[PDB]
Design a protein around this ligand. Structure first.
Ligand SMILES: Nc1ncnc2c1ncn2[C@@H]1O[C@H](COP(=O)(O)OP(=O)(O)OP(=O)(O)O)[C@@H](O)[C@H]1O
Ligand SMILES: [Mg+2]
Lengths: 48, 49, 212, 148, 198
């Protein structure tokens, strides 16, 4: 019953091309991480 | 009535149930229900042991 | 009385939203994933609270829909609060071929495990090879280089359909995969034996499928 | 069997501490001093050195205890000074082995008050070496410097 | 069960739209009267609701709200382009004091285009368009097109509000501070912003 039903459809798709719909919610935009920059200060002090 | 039949025609599930006549599809569905019931019985028997 | 859940929400709906499976499933459903019988946890959860989830998502102007084959998915309306997108025609070729594979009893002996090569061979068997080649590259005339390009595009689309939940790769082998019942939505244009154009118009009116 | 013990705690370049080492007791160790002296800060340094998972660490005030707040700031950054910082523990194992665990802490430049952590461990260190001296270089006339 | 106030909050008619905007990464400022008031009222519970997704709901010190995903985020993440942060830091610079007298809060695309071209170094501009480019008209036209594109992206983030007409003139919101520099006691904002832009 379906062999003909579906096979002809594939054969002749491009005479009536159609497309399905899907949910495509947006992605969460985030900041691009810049190269990590630490604080360097060569601290000194009197030792207890 | 034609609209009701057209509505139901699309709602058939898979190949073995593709009797395009809905009323004829009912009994095939119920045959599946019986088959499923037997499988369930065997599986629960296995689970007990 | 006041300060009582029932004032603002049905108890069953609040009970569903408080479940530990909800966040994963909501994130995936909004992403377009289809839910079949195999992932029991999610499918059973959907069955338990179906009406509550349908009424909830209705607030966004989207229908939570259940196909007769038993798989759930989201279909946005025209006034949808959530964006909507359409698949490519190559995606359709591979999808219909995956469906035909699922039905085929001659290959039932594979026990569900298929290889990309077999899929490619079936596709080329039914479609017009060279004229379908027109979409891969405008200058293709059967060259093996262009054949490899077609194979790689097929591989990529198959991966994308994996993300949609239409197919599962094996745990250790990425060259072999197993089908799921969600593929049957590719047959929506032929499952009823009637005039194709009226079927097409009904689908487009229902929001299932757009033209190109 | 002889159970293991924590010998000491060391802080370097924390808010108010340049290089200080507390010697713990076998049973009980007490910290005293007026408000704002730095007791809770010492607690925080210890626990940070024990579990460096930055997703978990959240130092609320003692008031507002038990309130799940999601505060904008976890409260660790302000307890550190600019430059490099350390927090280390000396432990005597049941096998009578001396092991020094710890972390290197450092503020992150940028609007977000973020912090960087890098754990480390030392084994076999001679018993005569103190962590305070191991982590610093004597530059000038008794004016030591910290080293990365 | 579920906390009563949380159920009340998410029962509100404003929630679905705000949820859709937040998951897209939009920032809610003091401009959006109703949304901002809603967040102010139900923050204590919304923070818990979104923590279930491994995503953080933060209120910036300036006053605007936004979401920050963790590494284990349940919402699919996406990341801005280099040119995007360049333009963002430029807008942060334009949020200046003489701005009030210069433009009364309403800028034009050309202000930003010329500022970007004047202040940035040529090498990173070429890296933005394409390394093979060299000081040519078509490259500048492409850079203009890219500037308009990224500006629209930022408008989706809520950073910049276009005035309602087809022409490209806009106003800068306070939430642009997210691109800004670290502030230390007594430091001049102009200098620190320029120091990072350099
Ligand atoms: N995150 C921070 N940022 C800035 N200053 C801080 C921070 N945490 C602590 N301080 C300051 O460091 C000093 C030490 O605080 P701490 O809580 O450690 O003291 P304490 O002796 O334990 O006090 P109390 O017994 O009252 O809790 C206080 O001045 C406190 O204000
Ligand atoms: Mg204290």
């Amino acid at each position: 019953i379906f062999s003909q039903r579906l096979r002809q459809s594939v054969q002749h798709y491009f005479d009536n091309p159609w497309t399905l719909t899907v949910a495509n919610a947006e992605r969460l935009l985030d900041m691009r991480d810049e190269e990590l920059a630490l604080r360097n200060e060569e601290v000194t002090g009197e030792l207890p | 009535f034609i609209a009701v039949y057209q509505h139901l025609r699309e709602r058939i599930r898979q190949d073995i149930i593709r009797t395009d006549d809905p009323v004829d599809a009912i009994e095939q569905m119920e045959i599946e229900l019986a088959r499923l019931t037997e499988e369930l019985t065997a599986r629960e028997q296995k689970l007990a042991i | 009385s006041s300060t009582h859940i029932e004032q603002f929400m049905p108890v069953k709906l609040a009970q569903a939203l408080a479940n530990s499976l909800f966040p994963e499933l909501d994130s995936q459903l909004r992403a377009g994933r289809h839910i079949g019988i195999d992932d029991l946890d999610n499918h059973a959860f959907l069955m338990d609270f179906q009406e509550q989830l349908e009424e909830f998502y209705a607030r966004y102007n989207v229908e939570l829909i259940r196909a007769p084959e038993g798989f759930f998915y989201l279909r946005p309306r025209s006034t949808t609060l959530i964006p909507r997108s359409v698949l490519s025609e190559l995606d359709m070729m591979v999808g219909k071929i995956l469906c035909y594979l699922y039905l085929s009893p001659e290959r039932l002996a594979n026990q569900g495990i298929f290889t990309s090569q077999e899929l490619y061979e079936e596709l080329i068997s039914l479609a017009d090879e060279g004229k379908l080649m027109k979409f891969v590259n405008q200058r293709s005339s059967g060259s093996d280089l262009d054949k490899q390009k077609l194979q790689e595009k097929v591989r990529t689309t198959l991966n994308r359909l994996r993300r949609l939940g239409m197919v599962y790769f094996l745990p250790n082998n990425n060259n072999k995969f197993t089908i799921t019942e969600a593929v049957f939505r590719f047959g929506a244009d032929v499952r009823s034996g009637d005039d194709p154009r009226e079927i097409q118009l009904r689908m487009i009116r229902d929001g299932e499928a757009m033209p190109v | 069997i002889e159970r293991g013990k924590f010998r000491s705690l060391t802080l370097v370049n924390w808010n108010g501490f340049f290089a200080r080492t507390f010697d713990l007791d076998e049973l009980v160790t007490t910290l005293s001093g007026g408000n704002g002296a730095g007791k809770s800060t010492t607690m925080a340094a210890f626990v940070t050195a024990l579990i460096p998972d930055l997703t978990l660490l959240h130092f609320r005030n003692t008031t507002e205890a038990g309130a799940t707040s999601g505060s904008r700031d976890k409260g660790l950054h302000g307890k550190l000074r600019a430059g490099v910082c350390y927090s280390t523990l000396d432990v005597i194992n049941s096998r009578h082995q001396r092991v020094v665990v710890g972390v290197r802490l450092q503020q992150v430049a940028g609007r977000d008050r973020k912090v960087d952590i890098k754990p480390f461990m030392i084994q076999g260190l001679p018993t005569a070496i103190q962590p305070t001296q191991l982590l610093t270089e004597n530059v000038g006339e008794r004016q030591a410097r910290v080293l990365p």
